[PDB]
Structure formats: C-alpha cells, structure tokens
Amino acid sequence: VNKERTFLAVKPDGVARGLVGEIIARYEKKGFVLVGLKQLVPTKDLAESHYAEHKERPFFGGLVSFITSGPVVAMVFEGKGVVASARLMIGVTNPLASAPGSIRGDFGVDVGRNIIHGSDSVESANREIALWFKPEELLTEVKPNPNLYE
Amino acid sequence: VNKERTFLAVKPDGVARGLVGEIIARYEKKGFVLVGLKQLVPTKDLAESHYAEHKERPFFGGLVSFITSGPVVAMVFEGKGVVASARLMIGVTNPLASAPGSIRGDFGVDVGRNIIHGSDSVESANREIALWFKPEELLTEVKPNPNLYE
Amino acid sequence: VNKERTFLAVKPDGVARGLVGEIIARYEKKGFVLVGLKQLVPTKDLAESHYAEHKERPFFGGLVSFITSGPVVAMVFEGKGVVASARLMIGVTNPLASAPGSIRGDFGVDVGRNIIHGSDSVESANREIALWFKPEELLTEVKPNPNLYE
Amino acid sequence: VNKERTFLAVKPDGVARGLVGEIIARYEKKGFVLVGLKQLVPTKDLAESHYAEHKERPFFGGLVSFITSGPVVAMVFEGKGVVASARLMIGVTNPLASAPGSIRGDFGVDVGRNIIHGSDSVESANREIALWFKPEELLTEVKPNPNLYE
Amino acid sequence: VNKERTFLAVKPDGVARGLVGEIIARYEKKGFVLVGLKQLVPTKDLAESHYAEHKERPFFGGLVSFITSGPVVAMVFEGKGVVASARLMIGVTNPLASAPGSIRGDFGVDVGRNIIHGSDSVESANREIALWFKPEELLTEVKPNPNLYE
Amino acid sequence: VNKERTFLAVKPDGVARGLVGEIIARYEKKGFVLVGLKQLVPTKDLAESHYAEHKERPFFGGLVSFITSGPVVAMVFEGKGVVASARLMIGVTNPLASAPGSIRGDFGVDVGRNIIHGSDSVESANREIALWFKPEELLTEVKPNPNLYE
C-alpha cells in the first residue's frame, strides 16, 4: 500500500544549521508526500517518551536534553516503502560512516549532532506519528504525482 | 530591531509541485529564522478572510477556491526587513514578468498558479500571521547565526 | 494560448562546456514543455539562413563559422509567453551585462561565446522552428502539469 | 579506447516529471560526451523490439504500454567505461533500493515508474543504439575536455 | 582585455558561514580564472590601508575591527571585464537591497556583515591585489578556455 | 578529537575544470573547518617528496609530471575524523569505481586525472600538511560550530 507513513524530525541542530528546506526538498524529489509538518519545541515529557527505548543508556540524558534545547521540525511523509527509504536516505547512526549523498553523510559529523531522526519501522513510525501528531494535523486525501506509481 | 516578521504560505500548486523544500531553503540561506510552520487545508472562512482586500475583484472568485483545494504550508520568518526582502525574492505577481533568481521568476508561469504568498507590509504580516497562527505556535527565544548581524 | 512555442539552440560553446542539462533543466523547472530536441552539427547553409538578418554585419562571418564549428542542441519549448520568458531567462546580448540568475549572466563572458540562442519573437520563433524542425519531430499532444495553468 | 558508448533514454515518467535536464547534467558533469540526442514517441514495434529479452515476463505487458504513452528522450554518451558507469549512476532496478546519489535512488519510488533506461553491456548498447539511432544522427569528430583523459 | 583582474575577498562572516566554496564556484562558473587564492587573518595594518578611503568616513571603526576579527579568503580572478562583472554578481552594499541571484541577495541581510568585498574599479583592483598578494603567489600563466572568449 | 586535520589538494585537472568551489563546498557543508588554503604550482621537488611512497612504483613518472603541470589548490581541513571522512567523500582510486555522491564518482572517469588527492592516514596528513604548508599559513584559532560537535 502507498499509505505507508514514517516520522521524521530535524532536530535542533539541522534546524539552527539551516537545513530544513534542503532536507524536506530531498524527500519531495524522491516522490513522497508531506502529510503533516510543524515547528515546536519538544517537551522533556515528549522527549523521554519519544526516546523510550534508550531509557537506561548513558546518553539518554545527553539526548532528551538536546532534543528539547530548541525547536524541532516534525513531519510525516507517505508513500511506498517510505519507512525504509527514508532511513536509507538519512544514513547510519554515525555521520562519519554515512555514505556521501545521504543526509548524515553530507552534513553530519558528530553522533550527538546527527541532524535528523527517522522511524526505524512501521511500528515505531506509528508510535511516533500518533504521539507527535493529533490525527487532525494529518492529511487524508492523498495522491502524489501519478508518474510515481503504476 | 531584528525581530520583524512576515507570514509566507506555499499554495496548493507549490506544495503539489514539490517546492516546499526549495522555497524554505531560500529564506533559510538568506539568513532569516523560521519562527512558525505548519501544513493544512485552509477553510473558506480563513481564506476569504485572507483575501479580504480582493472581495469584489473578478478573481477573488477562483482565488478562494484554490487555496482550499489542497494543502498549504504556512510560515513566519524573522530578521531585518524580512517583509520587504521576502517579496523581492518572490518576484512580481505575473510569474512571467518575474526576474530569474526570484521564486515566481524561476518556477511560475501563470497568475492563478503563482505558487507563493507574501506579506506586503509589516501591518499586513502581523495581520495574516494572527489569522493563520495561534500565539503558542511561534518561537520566542530566537538566536539567528551569530555571524549574521553586527 | 498555451501553445506559444519558441526556438532555443545551445551553441557549440554551451555544449562543449557541459551546459546542456543545466540549461534544459531551467526551462523544465519554470513550467515549459519540451516539444522537440536533437543534436546536429548545423550546416553553413542553415547557419546563414538562421542568421539571415545579420548578413551584412562585420560579425556574420565570425558567427556562422562558429555556429557550425561543432554540434548544437536545438530545441523547442511550449507554454504561455514562452517566447519572451525564455529571452528574459537567457539574459542580454553581452554576457557581462546579463544579470546574475540568467543563463548568460551566470555562465557567459564573451559576446562571441554567449552560449544559447532564443527566438526574439513569435514570428522568428516560427521561422526558426519550421527551419530546423520538420513537423514530424515535434509533439502535438501536450498538457504540462495542471498546476502550472489555471 | 575512450570511444565506448551507451544508449540511455529518459522514459515518459522522467520526461514528464521534468528531469531531462538533471539527468543529462549528471552524465555531463561526470565527463562523458553527448554523441546523439532526440525526443520522440516510441512505437510498439521499436519498444517491443527494445524489450525483446522480456517477451514472456509478466511485466513486458505494461512495459511496452508505457514507453509509448508519451515522450522519450533517447541519447548516446561516450567515454571510458561509460556503459558500466552509467548503470552505477542510475542505481538498481528497484528505486527504493537504489542508493542516494544515484538517479533511481534520488527520484524513483516504484519499479514501473523507474524513470530511466541504460545499456547493461557494450553489446547491448551497440544493439539499442542502432535500434533508436540512424547512423547519421550521431557525432564522429569528438573531443572531450582536454583535461579529462591522460 | 581577457586579462583584466579583480581582487575579491570573502569576509569573516562569509568564511564562518560556509560560503567560500559557493562564492568561488559562482565565479568559476561564469568563466573567470583563479589567479590568486589564500587564507590569512588580516593584520590591522592591511585592513587600514585596504579600507583607507573611508577614514574620515565614520564606520571605519567597524570595517577594520570586524575584518581583522577572523580568517579571510583572499582571491584574485582574471577575465574580460572581471572587475565590473564580479561587483555585479556581488549585488549592492545593502544585502536587503541586493536582488536574488547575487551573493549578497541570496545570502546576506545586514549591511555590517555583507559577506564579501570586491574591487570597485580597475584602479582599486591593482592597488588591492598588490597590497594583499605578492607577485610570486599570483599565476603568470593563464590558459583562458577557448569556449569562453572568441 | 575535533581537531584532527587532513591535507586535501585539488589537482590540476580539478582546478582546470572549475571544481575548486564545489569541492571546497562539499567539505564546508559536512562541518569541517578550513584551516589552510592556497594556490601554487608544485615544484618538482614537492611533487617527488609528496608522492615519494610510489618511487619504485612504475607510474611515479606521470603523478609528478602531471601534478607539476599547472596550478594546485592546497587545502587543510580540521575536524573529528576528517582524515577518514574526507577520503570517503573522495571515492576510490578509479573514478569509474567511485560511487555517485563522492567527488570522483560525480566528476571523474579516468584514473590518471582523478581530480583530488587526500591524505590516507593521520600519519600522512601531518607529514603532507607540513611539507605543503608553513606553520604561519595554518590557523591556530578554531571555533568549531556548536551545532556540529557535542
């Protein structure tokens, strides 16, 4: 189904660095639709839940602190395989090991400031969407360029 | 004093031609700070309230009928003379008459499908901002690049 | 009418300099359709007729010589106001006086190597199309993105 | 010896998504010389003759039915291992699986609408070139950038 | 002559914003040749000599303090009419007044930190070029592209 | 440490093709800081010392002759893991083998003229950096962007 959605959030570093458009631009070009988008400064409460699975790791502290140290451009893209393609496009956890051509590969250098977050799977995509987005903020009627899909 | 704001909004034809990234990136490279942002489908009420000044104009008709036929990305940016600088970057009403390097100049071709809206005067920015944006959807502690202003 | 066509030809200098895609790219983005396109090395006979109105000027010699000293990517774009918009996008005769953002302004430096040629009016557009293009080489069925025109 | 050629062709979905410039520019920046080029609407004959190797495959069906539903930009480039290098730049069959930086990787999302075709082996280039191109539509006196080869 | 030269300098606010490459590439694109290039930190001496003409002018204070406040990438480009062309590409004194397409229009918003200085006349160029560069650093051998000048 | 340094050099074939700005901007984009920069023409001495390791290696002949055959833009970038990251961005020895996204994959097609050299290890970097640069040319003051490193 071409309804697969994912959740992306350009953190306070891709934001203060002037990358919001560049990043969105890359997904628009691939062929994915933007079904939600907004700017907000994440709450500790939202930071801790967003980052639930890292509750016990040394860096969870360093994480939530930063992800709410400024604005975050949260968004949702839809399309076939969107969840895995986005990751692929994002790169790997460490910017320095990210191949050139991927968001992290091209602009990233330090794991702590690795620019963007993208759902690792449909399940977390959905936990992430619902969580940041109230169903009203999303689109419903969606048909990207009929030259994308057969 | 470096806090001037304008409300821009990419219309259904910009948002659907996959130009939200490009457009945002342009003001972003210029140096203005994004202070609000959100996708949505405008309502006849807010749209007709937007085009108040064009009520009896023969085009107000299909004007309101287009900024509600799909998604709109609203936004507010901030910095020195952003209001005047934005329009300049947008171009002129007729995209065919806009200079290359401007937004309508580079991607527009018809007056109905002229891609983006801008605030023509502070008074008007402040007026369209409050329309589209609630007071708690816009940043406050701002800090543009420290290399940007003297 | 959205059938206005124009004739553009990237001369042997925009060609050997690696500009064909860049140049085409700019017209595709503005919103114009490509109704014909081909590579060929112009004939003296075609050069002299193409450049008919400069038959008596000192440079006509220097012109036709060069315009057939190599391959030329001849093309035809269609859309509203295509003839005048293209010129505007091309710049002025002298690259050095061409505003930045226009093809000549950005890549041009010497009038003799000013990169591209674009019809100055419908009348020469048509004399130029017919002349380089046999009606069979052009398209007929044409509808660009319905987000360009109202 | 530096004369290898491949026949690439931007399909109805690339040509219609306004990607002929971008695609051409990529091989152009790489260093290959364009040695032929032409837009056109392929015929069932030449198309089915193109996809000969896929005759009984369940997709040959709507395969031939798409490369004839609109315009196609055929082209031939030339240089060292262009044949192998082209494919690499194109990506892999599934656009979702193509790496960012490649053509299908950056703009594709479905296998039916995968944008561009390429020659997978010299023997196959030479085979598709002669199909689409008459012997008098391709350059002969070629001279790539003098800084390009040793 | 195709051997005119201008002295350009990406100011500290330019070097700090990651603009060196972009700025340099705009020029390499137009067709000018890099004859001189180097990063240094201007000594108060050089800044006073270089910005001499504005001594009695009030703002001399900032121009020099600011300009010595960090690294500078000094450049000397050669080319037919480079002096007047380069300043055109730069835009006007106020980045808010500069039009899109020019270095200051695309990137700057405040007069105090307007990214780049460029020689205003062939008078100031040779003056500034000698004051910031030494005969041995500047190339004597220039091979102007044949597809550039006639 | 965020103070590792690599020595990069755009070879003659790179300077001649108008690639300095692009190459430099790829690095400024990633997040590395330019610490050293200058254009010179390598003396046969420097080229032999610099390319020493390949003496017994056959192709020593070309590497040095070619590398002295024109201007060079010498660079020294600083950054966490710059050495290994920079070589990754460059691609592999053969530009035909390099993947899109890297300097050599996007731009080169022949091993002999592969545009840029980059230090292979922190061992070779400090060696090469001292041999091509002088303590006074290299910045001592570095202010690494806060949105870059944690």
Ligand SMILES: Nc1ncnc2c1ncn2[C@@H]1O[C@H](COP(=O)(O)OP(=O)(O)O)[C@@H](N)[C@H]1O
């Ligand atoms: N080694 C670590 N040191 C510091 N921060 C880390 C480390 N590992 C992960 N993080 C950070 O928090 C996130 C960890 O999530 P995960 O490891 O799943 O990566 P990804 O973001 O690719 O899903 C990273 N994105 C990064 O900001």
Ligand SMILES: Nc1ncnc2c1ncn2[C@@H]1O[C@H](COP(=O)(O)OP(=O)(O)O)[C@@H](N)[C@H]1O
């Ligand atoms: N003659 C016209 N026909 C159709 N649409 C028009 C016409 N004049 C203006 N409009 C449309 O309505 C909007 C009118 O606002 P205004 O004329 O102030 O433009 P701007 O966006 O430059 O402020 C335009 N953006 C355009 O889409």
Ligand SMILES: Nc1ncnc2c1ncn2[C@@H]1O[C@H](COP(=O)(O)OP(=O)(O)O)[C@@H](N)[C@H]1O
């Ligand atoms: N002053 C001149 N010296 C040399 N070549 C010239 C001169 N004037 C015009 N040409 C050349 O031939 C063409 C002249 O046509 P025209 O003057 O109408 O310019 P355009 O190409 O803008 O229509 C130019 N494009 C340029 O290559």
Ligand SMILES: Nc1ncnc2c1ncn2[C@@H]1O[C@H](COP(=O)(O)OP(=O)(O)O)[C@@H](N)[C@H]1O
């Ligand atoms: N499973 C499939 N379903 C739909 N279309 C397919 C499938 N396999 C291949 N095709 C289509 O037919 C072409 C088949 O050729 P091939 O598989 O050799 O691809 P490539 O373009 O990588 O050589 C593709 N480009 C694609 O559009």
Ligand SMILES: Nc1ncnc2c1ncn2[C@@H]1O[C@H](COP(=O)(O)OP(=O)(O)O)[C@@H](N)[C@H]1O
């Ligand atoms: N009104 C001003 N306030 C502050 N600094 C200024 C002012 N006007 C000029 N400057 C600075 O002085 C610089 C050099 O001189 P000038 O203004 O004559 O030429 P240009 O502006 O083209 O460089 C400018 N580039 C700008 O950085």
Ligand SMILES: Nc1ncnc2c1ncn2[C@@H]1O[C@H](COP(=O)(O)OP(=O)(O)O)[C@@H](N)[C@H]1O
């Ligand atoms: N097979 C070869 N034929 C010609 N020149 C070569 C060959 N292999 C290497 N070179 C040149 O020698 C250079 C420097 O050394 P090396 O190949 O060890 O590292 P790198 O290739 O990463 O620079 C290469 N960059 C390339 O320009």
